Design a protein around this ligand. Structure first.
Ligand SMILES: CC(C)(C)OC(=O)N[C@H](C(=O)NO)c1ccc(-n2cccn2)cc1
Ligand SMILES: [Zn+2]
Length: 886
């Protein structure tokens, strides 16, 4: 079970200059012929020629057109092909092979596989070795010449990288196409697509060189009308990279292709981007609102890969966060600019602090550049991606737009790349910014190597006579398995000072640079005692301990200029309340109290929520955040041995407290919001997307949920009327909130009928049901399995049925262990054909050692059971071994 170590990087003792591919697709098999024009590198030392090759059936292999003999000249064990050096040339030579593979039965969705009636490849990170023999690593750059052949009736559209240079008919109702792609590339950027594809197209003229770029977006014929928004998003992405970064698209054509079966959101390949259908396809009638932001970010994401994917080659997979973190950052900038809503940034923060923080304090914790790996398929984490992006984002916060853009330019021009190369580039901008060639970003590198979430805490002092304000800051990171001693990080703290009398900014834009374990920042000429507005925009990926009173937090919530600090101040008020009530419920349970008291929710806090809700000029998206308690996975980072039942009771009490005061306000707003929220003026305009309007629907649907849970008088009338809405976000909401009423299975049937004839819509429906707050939710899942899901191997179907259920605090964590047992059964069943998705379904277990003693034991027993499965994949095993600290 080999472990790859970052310190042991060494260049290959070979070179592959040219790849010449012949991929012949047949009904029961695919024949791949490959000729590799190879050479010997300056690092060679007489070693064996070892190719990666997984699951390949050899017809023959050769060197210089002379067939090799097994046992004497080469061995193959279904993973590595070893050709003994004595039979390996010492100058330029040709290696060739013919193998048979079977996309029809490739249910792991890696390498070459069939999705519905489309043949498609997925080669990142190590899928190309599943197609043909290769030195399957990201620093092996080569030229590609690829011919594809297939039955013309079944596969009329043939696509691969580069230019289609030839099309030819073949005897037997077959045809062929040849694609030459001269620029060098890594093999994980190789792609091939074949199918009965329909497309929308457009021409984009670039800003500077005025070159015409053809844009194609493909799907199966049935869903071709759902492709327009994706096309628009692509236009948007090209324009943004132009305007913000000055980068034009390098090529003359861009293809986006949607497939039904895909392990992740999408995959960039040079000129040919392949997508999960749920991240490319949408219509107003058959998609929930969330799809539109999702497609925008994913299309944008794969697009921003393009310019840097050229010019910059990863030395090795340990530099993944440099590729992925930078792109997520660019994607985030794009999305914030395109949506123009503050909830876009908030939603990314909400994601980081729930999911990634949980990961970073779990046994799976790793830095964004890990020191080792067993399975590359487990390397693609929220830590590598989302903490990666926040570390990439901090460079911008530190430098500002002008110098950031200068540093980014340096990085591209100057540059195989490492995270250090990016740092060095940004460092040069840093020097120029501070006009001090002695200035450096050496400490910043700790963001790449140090695991765990730093804690930043504050103390304050105001001297009224001196007009002098001080902010005392402390940072620390808890030791973990990756570092016994944690060093202080370079932490940029974006701050303002709010005058509590009139809500005005008291100082200009200021970013404190914390570089020590602690420091004191002093401000003179501060006329009155301020309320500090800290980590504006969430300027560092840290736990913030603001040490503010709730009165101060309320004042920030009402009057601060920064959306994140307002939202965080709200969050912190909620957390103080949750921790207090949790401990009160816990003591009552422990001590078997017959009676006890609960601390009520702060009344001025409830007044502040009402104030903001009733402000017609305030933002609807932001409003939906303030009436929602913090995520369970955020809360859990703050509680030891969490009793999920006691947390459930805590949330219930707090929601009830606030509703008992504000429900009439909620109902009034739910009604007055209807006209603008559900405005149908542009319903049939496929390209008109209004993110403010979708936020209004989010607010209405949030309020509807609060009112339904509270059994507000006659709310069922509003629920039934809601189900008749043309918007899936609304009529799917009507389903889940109807859970608290007798009419649930009525709406269950109605919404099923609406959903069943669209594959993606059906999956949203499954999700809605899966997350329904039903006491009979286990019986309901069983129904979904037997009637809808069955033995589907579509990752979308499986994740749709089970993942939302796992977020059901009271039910998934049922003390019998029944929920853990159920998901472990699904994981083990899935792992037989798709280990990557099996690992995805482990996600609820990631917090196992944070729970109360009994639930820890239950989760651990189920993981140990999974670990005991004789046929467990290497993927699942490694992951569960790390998670259970074994
Ligand atoms: C959601 C998004 C767009 C941020 O990421 C993806 O949809 N896919 C990423 C990616 O970087 N696409 O360019 C992704 C995630 C995992 C993998 N992967 C995981 C194992 C092997 N490959 C590949 C790509
Ligand atoms: Zn990416």
């Amino acid at each position: 079970p080999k472990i790859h170590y970052r310190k042991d990087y060494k260049p290959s003792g070979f070179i592959i200059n040219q790849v010449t591919l012949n991929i012949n697709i047949h009904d029961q098999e695919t024949i791949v012929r490959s000729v590799l024009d190879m050479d010997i590198s300056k690092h060679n030392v007489g070693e064996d020629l070892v190719f990666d090759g997984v699951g390949l059936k050899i017809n023959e292999i050769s060197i210089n057109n002379k067939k090799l003999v097994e046992g004497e000249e080469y061995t193959y064990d279904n993973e590595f092909l070893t050709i003994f050096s004595k039979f390996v040339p010492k100058s330029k030579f040709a290696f060739s092979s013919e193998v048979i593979i079977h996309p029809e039965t490739n249910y792991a969705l890696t390498g070459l596989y069939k999705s519905k009636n489309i043949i498609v490849s997925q080669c990142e990170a190590t899928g190309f070795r599943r197609i043909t023999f290769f030195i399957d690593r990201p620093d092996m750059m080569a030229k590609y010449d690829v011919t594809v052949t297939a039955d013309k009736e079944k596969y009329p559209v043939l696509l691969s990288n580069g230019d289609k240079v030839n099309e030819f008919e073949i005897p037997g109702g077959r045809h062929g196409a040849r694609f030459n792609d001269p620029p060098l590339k890594p093999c994980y950027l190789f792609a091939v697509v074949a199918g009965d594809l329909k497309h929308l197209s457009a021409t984009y003229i670039t800003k500077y060189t005025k070159k015409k770029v053809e844009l194609y977006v493909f799907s199966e014929e049935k869903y071709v009308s759902k492709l327009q928004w994706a096309l628009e998003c692509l236009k948007k992405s090209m324009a943004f990279d132009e305007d913000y970064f000055g980068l034009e698209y390098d090529l003359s054509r861009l293809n986006l292709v949607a497939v039904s079966d895909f392990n992740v959101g999408a995959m960039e390949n040079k000129g040919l981007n392949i997508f999960n259908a749920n991240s490319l396809l949408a219509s107003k009638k058959n998609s929930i609102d969330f799809s539109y932001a999702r497609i925008l970010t994913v299309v944008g994401h794969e697009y921003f890969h393009q310019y840097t994917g050229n010019r910059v080659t990863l030395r090795d997979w340990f530099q993944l966060t440099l590729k992925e973190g930078l792109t997520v950052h660019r994607e985030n900038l794009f999305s914030e600019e395109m949506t123009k809503t503050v909830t876009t940034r908030l939603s990314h923060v909400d994601l980081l602090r729930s999911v990634q923080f949980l990961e970073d304090s779990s046994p799976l914790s790793h830095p964004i550049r890990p020191e080792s790996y067993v399975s590359m398929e487990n390397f693609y984490t929220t830590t590598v991606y989302d903490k990666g992006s926040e570390v990439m984002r901090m460079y911008l916060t530190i430098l500002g737009e002008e110098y950031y853009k200068k540093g980014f330019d340096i990085y591209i021009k100057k540059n195989t790349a490492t995270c250090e190369d990016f740092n060095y580039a940004m460092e040069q901008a840093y020097k120029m910014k501070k006009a001090d060639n002695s200035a450096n970003l050496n400490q910043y590198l700790l963001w790449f190597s140090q695991s765990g979430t730093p804690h930043v805490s504050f103390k304050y002092n105001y001297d009224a006579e001196k007009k002098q304000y001080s902010i005392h800051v402390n940072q620390y990171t808890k030791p973990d398995e990756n570092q016994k001693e944690k060093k202080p990080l370079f932490i940029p703290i974006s701050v303002g000072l709010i005058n509590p009398e009139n809500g005005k900014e008291m100082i200009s834009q200021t970013t404190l640079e914390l570089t020590k374990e602690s420091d004191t920042f002093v401000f003179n000429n501060i006329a009155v005692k301020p309320i500090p507005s800290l980590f504006r925009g969430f300027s560092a990926p840290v736990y913030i301990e603001d040490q503010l009173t709730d009165e101060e937090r309320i004042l920030l919530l009402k009057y601060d200029s920064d959306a994140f600090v307002r939202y965080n101040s709200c969050t912190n008020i909620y957390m103080k309340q949750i921790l207090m009530n949790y401990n009160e419920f816990l003591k009552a349970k422990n001590e078997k109290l017959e009676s006890f008291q609960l601390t009520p929710v702060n009344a001025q806090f409830i007044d502040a929520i009402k104030y903001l809700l009733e402000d017609p000029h305030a933002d609807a998206g932001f409003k939906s955040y303030i009436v929602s308690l913090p995520q369970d996975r955020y809360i859990i980072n703050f509680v030891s041995n969490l009793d999920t039942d006691v947390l459930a009771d805590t949330k219930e009490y707090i929601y009830k407290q606030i509703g008992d005061k504000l429900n009439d306000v909620y109902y009034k707003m739910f009604k007055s919001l209807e006209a603008k929220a559900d405005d149908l003026t542009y319903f049939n305009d496929e390209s008109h997307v209004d993110f403010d309007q979708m936020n209004m629907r989010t607010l209405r649907n949030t309020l509807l949920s609060l009112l339904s849970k509270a059994q507000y008088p006659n709310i069922l009338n509003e629920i039934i009327e809601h189900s008749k809405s043309p918007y899936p976000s609304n009529w799917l909401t009507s389903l889940s909130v109807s859970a608290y009423f007798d009419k649930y299975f009525e709406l269950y049937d109605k919404t099923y009928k609406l959903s069943k004839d669209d594959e993606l819509l059906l999956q949203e429906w499954l999700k809605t049901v899966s997350r329904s707050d039903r006491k009979d939710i286990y019986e309901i899942l069983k129904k979904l399995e037997n009637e809808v899901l069955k033995d589907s191997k579509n990752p979308n179907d499986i994740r749709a049925v089970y993942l939302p259920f796992t977020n059901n605090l009271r039910r998934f964590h049922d003390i019998s262990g029944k929920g853990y047992k159920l998901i472990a059964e699904v994981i083990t069943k899935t792992d037989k054909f798709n280990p990557m998705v099996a690992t995805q379904l482990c996600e609820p277990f990631k917090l196992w050692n944070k729970l109360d003693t009994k639930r820890q034991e239950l989760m651990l027993n189920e993981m140990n059971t999974m670990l005991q499965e004789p046929q467990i994949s290497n993927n699942l095993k490694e992951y569960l071994l790390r998670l259970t600290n074994k």
